[PDB]
Ligand SMILES: *[C@@H]1O[C@H](CO)[C@@H](O[C@@H]2O[C@H](CO)[C@@H](O)[C@H](O)[C@H]2NC(C)=O)[C@H](O)[C@H]1NC(C)=O
Ligand SMILES: *[C@@H]1O[C@H](CO)[C@@H](O[C@@H]2O[C@H](CO)[C@@H](O)[C@H](O)[C@H]2NC(C)=O)[C@H](O)[C@H]1NC(C)=O
C-alpha cells in the first residue's frame with residue numbers, strides 16, 4: 058500500500074525539536090537580552106522567563122497534536138477551527154515568504170561559518186558562500202528524497218554534534234568560574250534597566266530565541282505512537298534547551314565582560330579566541346554543523362506542510378504524490394528546494410525577515426484561539442490528554458504581546474507583510490472556491506498533462 | 522477525466538527504455554552539476570587574496586590617557602584624598618579613558634635631597650591601604666593607573682640640581698617597589714633638567730619592561746625642537762614621550778600638517794603620543810574657538826592622545842578670578858568654587874554640559890567612543906594629502922574596514938575644500954560620496970551622505986566623513 062509509512066521514534070522526535078530550536082542564535086547573537094537588560098542577572102532572569110513562556114506554548118501544541126492528529130501544525134488546526142480561508146492564507150504566506158527565506162538564510166550562515174577560519178577578520182567572498190549554500194540545499198534535498206531514515210539519521214548525528222559543542226563551552230565556563238575567578242557574579246543587578254520598554258524588548262529577544270518548538274507537529278502522521286511519543290518528546294526537549302540556554306550565557310558572562318560581548322560579531326567566536334589557545338576553529342566548525350542540522354529539519358517540515366496543503370484541495374495535486382517504493386514525498390521536496398534556490402539569488406535577504414515578524418506569531422496565536430474555540434464548541438471530541446485552560450489563555454496573551462511589538466515599532470514592514478499574505482486571494486476565489494467542471498478546460502488539460510509527465514519522471518502516485 | 526495514473530499503469534509505462542535512460546541521465550547531470558558548483562566555490566575561495574594579521578596591541582594603544590596632576594583640586598575642599606578619588610571612576614568611565622596618570626603622591630619637603638623618600642606616601646593624600654583599594658576599584662572598571670615619580674615636585678628645579686646619582690638610585694628602587702605593589706606604569710617629568718637623560722631612561726624602561734610587557738613608562742620634556750625629541754628616542758623606542766612640539770603655533774593649518782608629517786617621517790611611523798604639553802591644559806595655548814578642532818585632531822591621529830583634567834569641558838584657568846593656573850579647580854557643579862560666589866555659569870560645568878548635545882563634553886564622549894572601537898582608528902594607516910590654502914586633510918584605513926576622512930579648517934575665512942588627492946594608495950582611494958559622523962559647528966545633521974567636490978567649510982570647522990571598503 059502506497060502510504061507515508063510512519064517511521065519516527067521518540068529519539069528522532071527529540072532530535073528534531075532540539076536540532077530546530079538550537080541554531081545560530083545561541084552562538085552568534087545572544088546580545089539582545091544583554092543590550093536591553095544592561096545587567097547579567099537580569100539577563101539570566103529574562104532567559105528563564107522566556108523559557109517558561111515557551112513551555113506554556115509547547116504544551117498547547119502537544120494537546121492540539123494529540124487532539125486533531127493531522128500533519129501541518131497550524132494549517133490543519135486552523136482548518137479544523139475556522140477552515141478554508143485563513144488556512145489558505147497561512148499556507149500561501151509560508152509558501153511565499155516564510156520558509157524559502159529562512160532556509161536560504163540558514164544555508165548562507167552555514168556557508169559563512171565554514172570558511173571563517175580561513176577568513177578570520179577578512180570580509181569573506183560573496184559568490185563562494187552562495188555556491189556552498191546551493192550545494193548544501195541540493196544535498197539535503199537529495200538525502201530526504203532518498204529515504205526518510207537517512208534524514209532522521211542526519212538529524213541525530215548533527216544534533217549530537219551541536220549538543221557536544223555546547224556542553225564543551227558550558228564545561229569550560231563552569232571550570233573557569235569555580236576554579237579561581239567568579240568575578241563578574243559578585244555585584245549583579247547593578248545598572249539594571251527596570252523600564253517597561255527595555256524589559257519588554259529583552260523578553261521579545263529572548264522569546265525569539267526559543268522559536269521552533271513546533272517542528273514535530275508538522276510530521277504527526279509519521280510518528281509511531283502519536284498519543285504517547287509527541288507530548289513525551291516535547292516534555293523531554295523543553296528543559297534541555299532551557300538549561301542549555303541558561304548555562305551557555307553563564308559561561309559567556311564568566312569569561313567575557315560586557316564591553317567585548319556587546320561589540321562582537323559572534324560571541325562564541327570571541328569566547329573561543331579568548332579561552333581556547335589553539336583549536337579555536339572548533340567553535341565556527343560547530344556553528345556550521347548546527348546550521349546544517351537546522352536546515353534538514355526545516356526542509357522536512359516544509360515538505361510535509363506542502364504535502365498536506367496539496368492533499369486538502371489547495372496547491373495542485375502533483376505535490377500530494379508518493380514514490381512507489383522508497384515511500385518519500387519527492388515532488389513536494391523538489392518544489393521546496395526550487396523555491397529556496399530561487400530565494401538564494403536575492404542579495405540582502407536579511408531584510409526579508411522583517412516582513413514576517415508579524416505573521417508567524419499571528420498564526421501561532423490563531424491556532425491557540427482555534428484550540429480554545431474547539432474546546433468551547435466541541436467538548437465531546439476524543440482527547441487523549443487535555444490540560445487546563447490556563448495555558449492557552451496565558452499563551453494567547455503572550456502572542457498578543459508578541460504581535461503588538463512589530464505593529465507599534467517597525468510598522469511599515471508589518472503592513473507589507475500583511476499585503477504579501479493577502480496577495481493570494483485572487484487564487485482562492487477564482488480557482489479554489491469554484492468547483493471543477495466549471496474551471497476553464499484549457500487550464501485543466503495543461504495541469505493534467507504536466508502532472509502526468511511529472512508523475513512518470515518522479516515515479517510517484519497518490520496515496521491509496 | 523483528468524486524474525493521474527494509478528500504480529499499475531505507471532509501472533507499465535515508466536519502465537520503457539527511453540524513460541529509464543532519461544531518469545539516469547538527469548541523475549548523472551544533477552551530480553556533475555553539484556560537483557561543478559563545489560569546484561567553483563573551492564576555486565573562488567583560493568583566489569580571494571588574504572588579510573594581514575592584527576598587531577597584538579597593548580592597553581595604551583586602545584584609547585586616551587588622562588592626567589590628574591593635582592589631586593585636591595580635582596575634587597575640592599577636604600575630600601582631596603586617595604579615598605575620595607574612588608567615587609570619580611564612574612565619571613572617568615563615561616569618557617572611556619583607558620588609563621589614568623596620578624600625580625606625585627610621595628613625601629617631598631623641598632630641595633633637601635636626603636629627606637624625600639619615593640616609597641612612602643605623604644599623609645595628606647591617604648595611607649598605603651586606600652591606595653590598594655583604589656587600584657582594585659579602578660581595575661574593576663578597566664582603568665589602569667600610572668604613577669608620577671618626579672622627585673622634586675615641590676620646588677622650582679624638579680630633579681634636585683646638586684646630586685645626580687642618588688636620585689637615580691631613588692627612582693630605581695621606586696620602580697621596583699611600586700611595580701610589586703601593582704601600578705601599571707610610570708611617568709617622569711622635566712627630563713631636560715636631568716643630566717644623563719638618555720642613559721637613565723633606557724635603564725628604567727628596561728626594568729619596567731622586564732617586570733612585564735604590559736607596563737608603560739612615560740617621559741615628559743618642555744622641549745619643542747624635533748632634534749632633541751629625536752635625540753632622546755634613539756636607543757629607546759618603546760617610550761611614550763610628551764612634549765611641547767605641537768604647542769608652538771598653528772596659526773596656519775599647513776604648519777600643523779608639516780609638524781605632524783615631519784614627526785611621522787622622521788621617526789619612521791612608530792607609535793607616538795599626541796598632546797600639547799607635558800602637564801598643561803589645552804586652554805593654556807589655544808583660543809576657545811579652536812578647542813573642538815584640536816580635539817578632533819588629537820583623537821584621529823595614529824597614536825595615544827593624552828589630556829589633563831578639564832580638557833573635556835574646556836576648563837580655563839583664566840576664565841575666573843585669582844588662582845594658580847598650574848592647578849585650577851574642576852567645576853563639577855555650580856557650587857564647585859565657593860569663593861567669589863555665582864561666578865560659575867551652567868555651561869562651564871560637568872553637570873550642565875552633559876545635557877547639551879552640542880557641548881564640548883559631548884564631542885569628547887563621541888570621539889572617544891569612536892577611537893576605542895574602530896580598527897582603522899585603532900591601528901590603521903595614516904596618509905595625508907594636499908588640499909586648499911589653510912586646510913589639513915588625512916585618511917585612516919586598515920584593511921577592509923570602514924575608512925575615515927578628516928578635514929580640518931585652521932582659518933578665519935570660508936573654505937571650499939577641493940580634495941586634490943591623486944596620490945593615495947589604491948586600497949584607500951576616495952569615493953564620490955561619503956557619510957558624516959559629526960562636525961564641530963552646528964548647521965548639519967549626521968548620517969546624510971555628502972558629495973566631496975563642492976565641499977564647503979565655514980570657519981574653524983572640522984568634519985568626520987566615513988566610507989566603506991570598495992574599489
Ligand atoms: C637593557 O638595555 C641595555 C641597553 O639599553 C641592553 O643591555 C644591557 O646593558 C647593561 C649595561 O648597562 C647590562 O648591565 C645588561 O646586562 C645588558 N643586558 C643584557 C646583556 O641582557 C638590553 O637591551 C637591556 N637588557 C635586558 C636584560 O633587557
Ligand atoms: C624649558 O624650561 C627652561 C626653564 O623654564 C627654559 O630655560 C632654560 O633654563 C635653564 C635653567 O635656567 C638654562 O640652563 C637654559 O639655558 C634655559 N634655556 C634657554 C633657551 O634659555 C627652557 O628654554 C625651556 N625649553 C624650551 C624649549 O622652552
Ligand SMILES: *[C@@H]1O[C@H](CO)[C@@H](O[C@@H]2O[C@H](CO)[C@@H](O)[C@H](O)[C@H]2NC(C)=O)[C@H](O)[C@H]1NC(C)=O
Pocket residue numbers: 786
Ligand atoms: C621624508 O619622506 C620622504 C619620502 O618617504 C623621504 O625623502 C627621501 O630622502 C632620501 C634620502 O635623503 C632621498 O634620496 C629621496 O630622494 C627623498 N625623497 C624624495 C621624494 O625626494 C624621507 O623618508 C624623509 N625625508 C628626509 C629628509 O628624511
Ligand SMILES: *[C@@H]1O[C@H](CO)[C@@H](O[C@@H]2O[C@H](CO)[C@@H](O)[C@H](O)[C@H]2NC(C)=O)[C@H](O)[C@H]1NC(C)=O
Pocket residue numbers: 835866868869
Ligand atoms: C556659557 O554661556 C554664556 C551665555 O550663553 C556665554 O556668554 C556669552 O559669551 C559670548 C562670548 O564669550 C558673548 O558674545 C555673549 O554676549 C555672552 N552671553 C551672555 C548672556 O553672557 C559663555 O561664553 C558660555 N561659556 C562658554 C565657555 O562657552
Ligand SMILES: NC(=[NH2+])NCCC[C@H](N)C(=O)O
Pocket residue numbers: 077078079080081082083265266267268269
Ligand atoms: N521555526 C524557526 N523559527 N526555527 C528556528 C528558530 C531560531 C532558532 N532558535 C535559532 O536560534 O536559530
